[PDB]
Design a protein around this nucleic acid. Structure first.
Ligand SMILES: C=C1[C@@H](O)C[C@H]2C(C)(C)C[C@H](Cl)C[C@]2(C)[C@H]1C[C@H](O)[C@H]1CC(=O)NC1=O
Ligand SMILES: [Mg+2]
Ligand SMILES: [Mg+2]
Ligand SMILES: [Mg+2]
Ligand SMILES: [Mg+2]
Ligand SMILES: [Mg+2]
Ligand SMILES: [Mg+2]
Ligand SMILES: [Mg+2]
Ligand SMILES: [Mg+2]
Ligand SMILES: [Mg+2]
Ligand SMILES: [Mg+2]
Ligand SMILES: [Mg+2]
Ligand SMILES: [Mg+2]
Ligand SMILES: [Mg+2]
Ligand SMILES: [Mg+2]
Ligand SMILES: [Mg+2]
Ligand SMILES: [Mg+2]
Ligand SMILES: [Mg+2]
Ligand SMILES: [Mg+2]
Ligand SMILES: [Mg+2]
Ligand SMILES: [Mg+2]
Ligand SMILES: [Mg+2]
Ligand SMILES: [Mg+2]
Ligand SMILES: [Mg+2]
Ligand SMILES: [Mg+2]
Ligand SMILES: [Mg+2]
Ligand SMILES: [Mg+2]
Ligand SMILES: [Mg+2]
Ligand SMILES: [Mg+2]
Ligand SMILES: [Mg+2]
Ligand SMILES: [Mg+2]
Ligand SMILES: [Mg+2]
Ligand SMILES: [Mg+2]
Ligand SMILES: [Mg+2]
Ligand SMILES: [Mg+2]
Ligand SMILES: [Mg+2]
Ligand SMILES: [Mg+2]
Ligand SMILES: [Mg+2]
Ligand SMILES: [Mg+2]
Ligand SMILES: [Mg+2]
Ligand SMILES: [Mg+2]
Ligand SMILES: [Mg+2]
Ligand SMILES: [Mg+2]
Ligand SMILES: [Mg+2]
Ligand SMILES: [Mg+2]
Ligand SMILES: [Mg+2]
Ligand SMILES: [Mg+2]
Ligand SMILES: [Mg+2]
Ligand SMILES: [Mg+2]
Ligand SMILES: [Mg+2]
Ligand SMILES: [Mg+2]
Ligand SMILES: [Mg+2]
Ligand SMILES: [Mg+2]
Ligand SMILES: [Mg+2]
Ligand SMILES: [Mg+2]
Ligand SMILES: [Mg+2]
Ligand SMILES: [Mg+2]
Ligand SMILES: [Mg+2]
Ligand SMILES: [Mg+2]
Ligand SMILES: [Mg+2]
Ligand SMILES: [Mg+2]
Ligand SMILES: [Mg+2]
Ligand SMILES: [Mg+2]
Ligand SMILES: [Mg+2]
Ligand SMILES: [Mg+2]
Ligand SMILES: [Mg+2]
Ligand SMILES: [Mg+2]
Ligand SMILES: [Mg+2]
Ligand SMILES: [Mg+2]
Ligand SMILES: [Mg+2]
Ligand SMILES: [Mg+2]
Ligand SMILES: [Mg+2]
Ligand SMILES: [Mg+2]
Ligand SMILES: [Mg+2]
Ligand SMILES: [Mg+2]
Ligand SMILES: [Mg+2]
Ligand SMILES: [Mg+2]
Ligand SMILES: [Mg+2]
Ligand SMILES: [Mg+2]
Ligand SMILES: [Mg+2]
Ligand SMILES: [Mg+2]
Ligand SMILES: [Mg+2]
Ligand SMILES: [Mg+2]
Ligand SMILES: [Mg+2]
Ligand SMILES: [Mg+2]
Ligand SMILES: [Mg+2]
Ligand SMILES: [Mg+2]
Ligand SMILES: [Mg+2]
Ligand SMILES: [Mg+2]
Ligand SMILES: [Mg+2]
Ligand SMILES: [Mg+2]
Ligand SMILES: [Mg+2]
Ligand SMILES: [Mg+2]
Ligand SMILES: [Mg+2]
Ligand SMILES: [Mg+2]
Ligand SMILES: [Mg+2]
Ligand SMILES: [Mg+2]
Ligand SMILES: [Mg+2]
Ligand SMILES: [Mg+2]
Ligand SMILES: [Mg+2]
Ligand SMILES: [Mg+2]
Ligand SMILES: [Mg+2]
Ligand SMILES: [Mg+2]
Ligand SMILES: [Mg+2]
Ligand SMILES: [Mg+2]
Ligand SMILES: [Mg+2]
Ligand SMILES: [Mg+2]
Ligand SMILES: [Mg+2]
Ligand SMILES: [Mg+2]
Ligand SMILES: [Mg+2]
Ligand SMILES: [Mg+2]
Ligand SMILES: [Mg+2]
Ligand SMILES: [Mg+2]
Ligand SMILES: [Mg+2]
Ligand SMILES: [Mg+2]
Ligand SMILES: [Mg+2]
Ligand SMILES: [Mg+2]
Ligand SMILES: [Mg+2]
Ligand SMILES: [Mg+2]
Ligand SMILES: [Mg+2]
Ligand SMILES: [Mg+2]
Ligand SMILES: [Mg+2]
Ligand SMILES: [Mg+2]
Ligand SMILES: [Mg+2]
Ligand SMILES: [Mg+2]
Ligand SMILES: [Mg+2]
Ligand SMILES: [Mg+2]
Ligand SMILES: [Mg+2]
Ligand SMILES: [Mg+2]
Ligand SMILES: [Mg+2]
Ligand SMILES: [Mg+2]
Ligand SMILES: [Mg+2]
Ligand SMILES: [Mg+2]
Ligand SMILES: [Mg+2]
Ligand SMILES: [Mg+2]
Ligand SMILES: [Mg+2]
Ligand SMILES: [Mg+2]
Ligand SMILES: [Mg+2]
Ligand SMILES: [Mg+2]
Ligand SMILES: [Mg+2]
Ligand SMILES: [Mg+2]
Ligand SMILES: [Mg+2]
Ligand SMILES: [Mg+2]
Ligand SMILES: [Mg+2]
Ligand SMILES: [Mg+2]
Ligand SMILES: [Mg+2]
Ligand SMILES: [Mg+2]
Ligand SMILES: [Mg+2]
Ligand SMILES: [Mg+2]
Ligand SMILES: [Mg+2]
Ligand SMILES: [Mg+2]
Ligand SMILES: [Mg+2]
Length: 252
RNA sequence: UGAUAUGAUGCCCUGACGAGUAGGCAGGCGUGGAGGUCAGUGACGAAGCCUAGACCGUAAGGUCGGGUCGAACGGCCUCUAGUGCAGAUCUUGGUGGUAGUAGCAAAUAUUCAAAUGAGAACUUUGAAGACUGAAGUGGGGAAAGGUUCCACGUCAACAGCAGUUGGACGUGGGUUAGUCGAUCCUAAGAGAUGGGGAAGCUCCGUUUCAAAGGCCUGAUUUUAUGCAGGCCACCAUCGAAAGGGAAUCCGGUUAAGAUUCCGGAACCUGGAUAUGGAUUCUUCACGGUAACGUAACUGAAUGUGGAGACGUCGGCGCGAGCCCUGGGAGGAGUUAUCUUUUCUUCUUAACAGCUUAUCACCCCGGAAUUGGUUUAUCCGGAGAUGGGGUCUUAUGGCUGGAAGAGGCCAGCACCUUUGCUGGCUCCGGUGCGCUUGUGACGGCCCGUGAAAAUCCACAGGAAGGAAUAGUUUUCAUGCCAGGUCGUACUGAUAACCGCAGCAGGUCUCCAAGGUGAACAGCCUCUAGUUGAUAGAAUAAUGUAGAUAAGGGAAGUCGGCAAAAUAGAUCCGUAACUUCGGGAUAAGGAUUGGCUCUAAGGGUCGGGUACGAUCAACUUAGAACUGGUACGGACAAGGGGAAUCUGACUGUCUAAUUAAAACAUAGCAUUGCGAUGGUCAGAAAGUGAUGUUGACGCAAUGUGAUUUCUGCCCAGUGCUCUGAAUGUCAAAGUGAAGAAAUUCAACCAAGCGCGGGUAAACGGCGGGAGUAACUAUGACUCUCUUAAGGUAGCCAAAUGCCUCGUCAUCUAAUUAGUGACGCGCAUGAAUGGAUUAACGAGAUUCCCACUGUCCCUAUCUACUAUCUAGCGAAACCACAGCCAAGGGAACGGGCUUGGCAGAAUCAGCGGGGAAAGAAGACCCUGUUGAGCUUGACUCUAGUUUGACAUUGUGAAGAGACAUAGUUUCUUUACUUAUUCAAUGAAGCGGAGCUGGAAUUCAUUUUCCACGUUCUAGCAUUCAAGGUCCCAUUCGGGGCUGAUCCGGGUUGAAGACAUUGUCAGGUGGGGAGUUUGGCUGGGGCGGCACAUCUGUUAAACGAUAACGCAGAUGUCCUAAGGGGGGCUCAUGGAGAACAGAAAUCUCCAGUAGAACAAAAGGGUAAAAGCCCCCUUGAUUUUGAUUUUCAGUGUGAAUACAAACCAUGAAAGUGUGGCCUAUCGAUCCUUUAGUCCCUCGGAAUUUGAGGCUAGAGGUGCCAGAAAAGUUACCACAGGGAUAACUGGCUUGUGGCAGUCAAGCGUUCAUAGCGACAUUGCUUUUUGAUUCUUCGAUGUCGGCUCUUCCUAUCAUACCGAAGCAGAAUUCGGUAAGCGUUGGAUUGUUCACCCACUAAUAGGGAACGUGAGCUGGGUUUAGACCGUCGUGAGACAGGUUAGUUUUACCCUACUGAUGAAUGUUACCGCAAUAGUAAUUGAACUUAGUACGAGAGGAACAGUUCAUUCGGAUAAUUGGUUUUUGCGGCUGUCUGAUCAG
């Protein structure tokens, strides 16, 4: 039979990201002298819409400490930051929405976005519109910090790892119904070519494990093992449970 | 054999015999080349070819003559082979019949004359009639073509008639650029390089782990370019003739080029530069409060800003061109009449000067009584309204360019080149106009709508600069230069692609007048066409366009097709609904022309109420008027009530399916925190998601809203912080051994155990009883499950029965709808129920409408048809008249008959089982392929373990058995390895100063140790300070800025990773397989290896899915020997004792027993009881059955042993006889201690030899699952489905006997028990014909035939009074209908009728139709299946080809029987009429009555037929008369 749809995506032909209009990668400043000893000041020169993104970017310019020139950065904008505002980044820096501080330097309950996984990676976690992470504790010996990510997971990372105070802007985007095919259409038009989706059960056997039969139906359990091999994994992969989730979610 | 004559395989005598497919052999014929020979033939004619001329041979063949021909060739003995054609849907080439045939019919359309020419329907010119109608048949380009462009010459081929013409042929000519494109830049993307993979062709990477490069000027005055600074670390390149982008215009000009040439007038870029002006003694300009002004007005490094540079729609404002229009100055048209009229010319480029703007901004001022203000509600104390100013120059105005150009006229000149002279080219108006441009605003987004080259600016101030004369080329003027390639033309019903001059396809710009909402249709101007074979007629049948009286879907599967409707204004508008809709719902009125009335606007002066003038179709109202017409052509929705179904818009099977299928929003579930999830790759320092981060990416399901989503985790999956002594690999460990090796324990993941999980796959019971008639069963019991279908919903697209029952709609309904529900087999995101709105979706009814029909008729155009020119194809064994017969069971040919007369034209669809393809169906084949799965066999990947990469400490266990070599567990180290970051920038350690801190002698320490009201500024090794050079202008050192170690900063760490084996997992993928016989195949059975009896026809042998049965075992005795005894059964007898217990006698041929099927066999046995036993053993041959006289099984008689038993003779080599079973390779055991391990030995081990065991039951013996309707190939009429043939059980029809029925009475009418038949529209049985194809059911149409007669004519019977009916005869002459439901045949109802008989003709009839059903490919549901898929279940959508031949049939001509004409005969063939009612007979005959006829007479009618057109009706190109819309001819007339 045929190579199924989820196998063809990895070869990246018509499936690569539609990148032309994007403002450029959002990152924190490089972690340098200023940021790990002192603080350094910047101005948000603009806050701007990035294509295929939920949340606005903020263009933030700084002075180059080692050379006379301006150096401009692209930040994900936290809700409430504004044009003309001064941004402070460094180990010793006041605790205010929009500033970037090492996770060690903020008290528990602090709310931060675009937080680094390792120190220096210029931010990894909690970048999507509406999201943040909460600092749930410190271990000053071995200087770690325990945080809770948007997924509900709780991870422990270096207290040197930087984050930015506040939550990411443009929240509530997903509360509004798309209402029609076209709105979805233009949505994925600026992301990648994932839409619309043919059901495997509407296909012929060559095309898909679910394909075929004189009635539409899966024909065997749609829960597939991790051990499964490419061309086998479609449906519910490695599911530990299945069915309507009753009762409260929200991990203890 | 006898020479001296010619064949010894010869010659001579004699007898018998002669069929032949497949096949064997023999003797001969013929061909290309080879050795030999005849000193062969031949230019005085070789070879070849032609020849109803000759001769030899049974024949293959040979020889000659004659004709034609021109260079070579043959006989004989031998050699040799690419050696002999009728076939192969054979190969290549050539040629016929078809046939002068099909045809050359789309795109409105042509005509008169002249010229030219051999020749003119077709060329050229003039005229006329039309067309395209600015959404072009106009004017240009992009792709593509490549000379097609232009001129001259010219018609052999080509342009499906023609040709003097051409995109043809021949010969030439033609494409001019600083400014138009390319060129330059960057887009998706492509791709070198240091590198890393790969055996390698090469793959990866593109700034990526790399010592990656070049500018500005200074230093030179050996001199040419070394070094002195300071930068810049930007790191290839290719990629747009529609993106970005330096700069040109107008007039003229060619056969053909032009933003390219000529003329004039500009502009850009680069290089040079000098004069003028500006600037400076206050050096680097002034002015303005400000916005900002300008002719100028130095400015390096570095930095920063801007331009390039950006969506879409909406109304509003403005510009340009076009459109409309007044006056005048010209030219043209019309003028019987009318029109101060109709048409036309009246123009102004780039570039330059001055000037011109919405927005924005500045100054004055200080606002509620809030004001300003847009079509659109936005603005103001963060300063409105007001007054005054500043800016952009889109754009317009005036002038320069520039009237000298161009346009339009008049007046002269003349073979020419061709002039010459004049005049005029002027001033206005209007706008919801049209196209296009642009501005200020507004709407929209989970969409917010490129990049780079390049240009300018500002911040900075390095530096360079004047008074006796410096600075300036962003001000003016001046000089030089601007290369390479493309440039023609077409751009399409003839220049491109479709084999072509093909009705197809193929990107785009410009766009006039009327009607009108309009870029619609229809008519016109400019421009362009007038191309498409032609002539004559107007039969049938057609294609395309129209109309029909009365009826109105009765037609049909179905209203298919057609008709009806329609614009606009006004009135009026239901259920239901998500409140948005439904809605143009539905239903109505009105509409011309002409003549009036009213309302709706602009602009200017008013001291600090109005007047005057000019320019626009809209809306309403009112009269008049007409053959009551008026959206007058054109243009333009049918509507309503329901069911099924998908929410909607959207999507697909190019070329049979547009749908209910796919998608969608919404709903739900799953995986993943980057050392990751999913996915790519041979590999990798590789890749997609990713410019990403859970409001995310990836993976499934369901399918908008509302409502609701029950129970089941036993199974299959998936999953788990679970269990643990069950299973379990390689390495490692232990034991035994001389080792090879053998055995053991330990043991990873996995398995097994346990838990979770259904919006995972999926599932969601059976049986009894029970309430005061019957019924029903709330209730009970009972089996059983993982749970036993909940809410809902239904004969539903899901119900077999089924055309379910009830109701409703109809005259009548297998239809529809509403109900009912023990529902074969409804049911919950396998989603259930509901649902407004929407649908080229399936279905039902209603209104309107109608030629769908009753039932047909008529008209137009183009065909067909006849002519000239032009001219194919399919197909073809030979051919073409029938009836019967037989025959491969449906003949054109054969047999017997009927018959039979040249040559032919138009038609036609009976036949040619016509043509189109080696049957798609069905079976066979040791033939495939797509697909699926716990089929067989593997595999990429993945997981798990071991070893290697692999090093350093310390603590803890483990051994020589409580010194430290070593091995593990734990946790530390960092240099291997791994990850991240950065133009490797501030790391680690110490020291300064502070200070929290309390001092238990002094610091024991720990934090620090230049930046946080503000949308400024931060750069020249840094100013400062200090020391130098020998004071120059410049320049250096140190400090400012603390020391020290050169580890770029982190993460990770001997773990990951990688490499080699090992176990798990692995339809993701690979490969393969998935019995036979068979009254087709399949299910079944076993007739597949066998045994008994019979079939079997008295030796033997013998078939069928023949008949009645049996076999894969059973037995230490049920085997062997010996002795004794006699059985089955019956009678008569004996306490309890009975039909049956145990005892006795008599009779007893086997009537019993001998494992088993049956049949043989047996009585001092072969049966039953007892005694002793292992011969059921050892060796190797022969034989019988089956047979090939192979094997296997089974058996027989001996030989050579050792034994058993009996007194003994004997008997015993398994079971009394006839069935009870198994090759080769391999493993295993027994045997002798025998052979071999090949350099020699010993010992293990291995290998041989003989005999057994492990098994093939498809039994002479492969290792093997499905599906295909997506399907394929080789074949089969050895083989099914359809016609036809034989049969006639079954079906149907008819008899004989006569017991009964019929009040009585067998036979009026019937008729049992029996029995004899016929028929071939029943259904079976068969398998003969067709599988290189004989098109399926039904209906429509139409003809003919049969009779077993429904009606109609004439009769005979009756349980015949009349009337009605029944039975029978001669009878097929004549008729046998209209509808509702169903695809139906059939069935069933309504209704009419004289009657509504049954049948055949390839189950008549598809080149006759139709295509509803069946039966390909799409799709929904039910049932089944794990699945692919299946269903003889339900449902929807699904390309119907060719006639010109022969014959038949219908009509139509016609040679020749001397010529020609007229009038006639009649052989043969055809033939036609049919049924009813009324009046009267007659209220009669007959009858108790009720009732109740007929003949003759008369008048009408039905069905059919042949004519005819006085009448009535239909038809209209009589385009005959009239009327009407729109436009065109100036008006009128007339068109
Ligand atoms: C398939 C087989 C094995 O799988 C099992 C085997 C036993 C049953 C163990 C013994 C018999 Cl006796 C033979 C056979 C059935 C064997 C037969 C196989 O065709 C042999 C026979 C031969 O010669 N070459 C083979 O290849
Ligand atoms: Mg990309
Ligand atoms: Mg897509
Ligand atoms: Mg989906
Ligand atoms: Mg989908
Ligand atoms: Mg499908
Ligand atoms: Mg599959
Ligand atoms: Mg599967
Ligand atoms: Mg399936
Ligand atoms: Mg399904
Ligand atoms: Mg002979
Ligand atoms: Mg002769
Ligand atoms: Mg000759
Ligand atoms: Mg010659
Ligand atoms: Mg020879
Ligand atoms: Mg040859
Ligand atoms: Mg040959
Ligand atoms: Mg032959
Ligand atoms: Mg031949
Ligand atoms: Mg032949
Ligand atoms: Mg032959
Ligand atoms: Mg001809
Ligand atoms: Mg013809
Ligand atoms: Mg034709
Ligand atoms: Mg013509
Ligand atoms: Mg016209
Ligand atoms: Mg038009
Ligand atoms: Mg052109
Ligand atoms: Mg010619
Ligand atoms: Mg030609
Ligand atoms: Mg021609
Ligand atoms: Mg160039
Ligand atoms: Mg490359
Ligand atoms: Mg380029
Ligand atoms: Mg370009
Ligand atoms: Mg361009
Ligand atoms: Mg020229
Ligand atoms: Mg000045
Ligand atoms: Mg652009
Ligand atoms: Mg210009
Ligand atoms: Mg002023
Ligand atoms: Mg207006
Ligand atoms: Mg915008
Ligand atoms: Mg500028
Ligand atoms: Mg200049
Ligand atoms: Mg042309
Ligand atoms: Mg064409
Ligand atoms: Mg005009
Ligand atoms: Mg033609
Ligand atoms: Mg009429
Ligand atoms: Mg009519
Ligand atoms: Mg009517
Ligand atoms: Mg129908
Ligand atoms: Mg209808
Ligand atoms: Mg229709
Ligand atoms: Mg309606
Ligand atoms: Mg009127
Ligand atoms: Mg229905
Ligand atoms: Mg739909
Ligand atoms: Mg199709
Ligand atoms: Mg459709
Ligand atoms: Mg279609
Ligand atoms: Mg590598
Ligand atoms: Mg769907
Ligand atoms: Mg419930
Ligand atoms: Mg329960
Ligand atoms: Mg379960
Ligand atoms: Mg082991
Ligand atoms: Mg189950
Ligand atoms: Mg229920
Ligand atoms: Mg019904
Ligand atoms: Mg009906
Ligand atoms: Mg039901
Ligand atoms: Mg039943
Ligand atoms: Mg459920
Ligand atoms: Mg279901
Ligand atoms: Mg609803
Ligand atoms: Mg519809
Ligand atoms: Mg014809
Ligand atoms: Mg004629
Ligand atoms: Mg032709
Ligand atoms: Mg015949
Ligand atoms: Mg005969
Ligand atoms: Mg024949
Ligand atoms: Mg006859
Ligand atoms: Mg025929
Ligand atoms: Mg034919
Ligand atoms: Mg065949
Ligand atoms: Mg076979
Ligand atoms: Mg296939
Ligand atoms: Mg299986
Ligand atoms: Mg499996
Ligand atoms: Mg660094
Ligand atoms: Mg390791
Ligand atoms: Mg697999
Ligand atoms: Mg397979
Ligand atoms: Mg087999
Ligand atoms: Mg078979
Ligand atoms: Mg046989
Ligand atoms: Mg069978
Ligand atoms: Mg057999
Ligand atoms: Mg046997
Ligand atoms: Mg016999
Ligand atoms: Mg025999
Ligand atoms: Mg049988
Ligand atoms: Mg005896
Ligand atoms: Mg034995
Ligand atoms: Mg035999
Ligand atoms: Mg033999
Ligand atoms: Mg036997
Ligand atoms: Mg023996
Ligand atoms: Mg023996
Ligand atoms: Mg015995
Ligand atoms: Mg064995
Ligand atoms: Mg032995
Ligand atoms: Mg040895
Ligand atoms: Mg030897
Ligand atoms: Mg040796
Ligand atoms: Mg066999
Ligand atoms: Mg054998
Ligand atoms: Mg056999
Ligand atoms: Mg074999
Ligand atoms: Mg099928
Ligand atoms: Mg019969
Ligand atoms: Mg019969
Ligand atoms: Mg019968
Ligand atoms: Mg009798
Ligand atoms: Mg009687
Ligand atoms: Mg019958
Ligand atoms: Mg046959
Ligand atoms: Mg047959
Ligand atoms: Mg056939
Ligand atoms: Mg045939
Ligand atoms: Mg045929
Ligand atoms: Mg036929
Ligand atoms: Mg009587
Ligand atoms: Mg009679
Ligand atoms: Mg007759
Ligand atoms: Mg019907
Ligand atoms: Mg009925
Ligand atoms: Mg028949
Ligand atoms: Mg038939
Ligand atoms: Mg047909
Ligand atoms: Mg059909
Ligand atoms: Mg159908
Ligand atoms: Mg259709
Ligand atoms: Mg034909
Ligand atoms: Mg025809
Ligand atoms: Mg009377
Ligand atoms: Mg009487
Ligand atoms: Mg008649
Ligand atoms: Mg008059």
């Amino acid at each position: 039979g045929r190579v199924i749809r989820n196998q063809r995506k990895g070869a990246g032909s018509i499936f690569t990201s539609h990148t032309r209009l994007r403002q450029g990668a959002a990152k924190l400043r490089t972690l340098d002298y200023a940021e790990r000893h002192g603080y350094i000041r910047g101005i948000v020169k603009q806050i701007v819409h990035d294509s295929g993104r939920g949340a606005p970017l903020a263009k933030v310019v700084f002075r180059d400490p080692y050379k006379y020139r301006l150096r401009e950065e692209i930040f994900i904008a936290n809700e409430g930051v504004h044009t003309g505002q001064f941004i402070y980044a460094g180990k010793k820096a006041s605790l205010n929405v929009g500033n970037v501080l090492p996770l060690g330097s903020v008290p528990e309950g602090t709310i931060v976005s675009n937080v680094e996984e390792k120190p220096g990676d210029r931010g990894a976690l909690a970048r999507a519109s509406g999201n943040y992470v909460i600092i749930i504790g410190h271990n000053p010996d071995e200087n770690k910090t325990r945080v809770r990510l948007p997924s509900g997971a709780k991870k422990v990372i270096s207290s040197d790892a930087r984050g930015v105070i506040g939550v990411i802007a443009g929240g509530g985007r997903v509360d509004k119904p798309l209402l029609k095919a076209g709105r979805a259409f233009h949505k994925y038009r600026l992301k990648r070519n994932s839409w619309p989706k043919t059901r495997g059960v509407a296909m012929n056997p060559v095309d898909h494990p679910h394909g075929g039969g004189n009635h539409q139906h899966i024909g065997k359990a749609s829960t597939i093992s991790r051990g499964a091999v490419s061309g086998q994994k479609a449906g519910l992969i490695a599911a530990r449970r299945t069915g309507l989730l009753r009762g409260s979610q929200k991990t203890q």
